[PDB]
Amino acid sequence: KLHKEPATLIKAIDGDTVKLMYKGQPMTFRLLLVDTPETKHPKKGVEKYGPEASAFTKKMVENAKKIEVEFDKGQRTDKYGRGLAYIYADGKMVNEALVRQGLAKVAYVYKTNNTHEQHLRKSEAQAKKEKLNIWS
């Protein structure tokens, strides 16, 4: 059973990355199970839908009154020291909102952290079906 913990927005970095104050310390969080187009792609510049996926995440966390983080059952940090979690803004999962809007693809790359994989897969199909953004 997963559980949500409070956090405070510090700043939105990218479509898939946000800096939050968590248990009194600043931490960078990488959104579990999604891959958004990058704006800070180490190699490829600004990918198509990057600006849009970034604006989307930023808007959602910046306008929330409450942000919560939910770790999965596997490892909690990646090799870069980023927290791996599902982020909620006023009870809405950011992870799902992105996929539903066709601003992210379902990744899945830490076999243990899969609690919401199916849920996300269904939203991605719907976004595909509606040919939105990425799927357009």
What can you see in these coordinates?
- The protein has helices at residues 50-62, 94-100, 117-129, and strands at 4-14, 17-22, 25-31, 34-35, 67-71, 83-89, 92-93, 105-106.
- By secondary structure, it is α+β, with helices and mostly antiparallel strands.
- The chain has one domain (1-136): OB fold (Dihydrolipoamide Acetyltransferase, E2P) (Beta Barrel), CATH 2.40.50.90.
Layout of helices and strands:
Blueprint: E1 4-14, E2 17-22, E3 25-31, E4 34-35, H1 50-62, E5 67-71, E6 83-89, E7 92-93, H2 94-100, E8 105-106, H3 117-129
Parallel strand pairs: 3-6
Antiparallel strand pairs: 1-2, 1-5, 2-3, 4-8, 5-6, 6-7
Helix pairs in contact: 2-3
Oligomer: monomer
The helix-and-strand class reads alpha+beta
Tell me the fraction of residues in β-strands, as a range. 25-35%
Radius of gyration: 14 Å
Number of helices: 3
Strand order within the widest sheet?
1-2-3-6-5
Largest sheet: 5 strands, mixed, barrel
CATH domain class: Mainly Beta
C-alpha geometry: globular
CATH architecture: Beta Barrel
Structural domain count:
1
Helix content: 10-25%
PDB class: hydrolase(phosphoric diester)
Keywords: hydrolase(phosphoric diester)
Assembly: monomeric
Entry title: engineering alternative beta-turn types in staphylococcal nuclease
Task: Describe what is shown at a glance.
By secondary structure, this protein is an alpha+beta fold. It has three helices and eight strands.
Main features:
8 strands, five-stranded mixed β-barrel, monomeric, staphylococcal nuclease, OB fold (Dihydrolipoamide Acetyltransferase, E2P), alpha+beta, two-stranded antiparallel ribbon, hydrolase(phosphoric diester), 136 residues
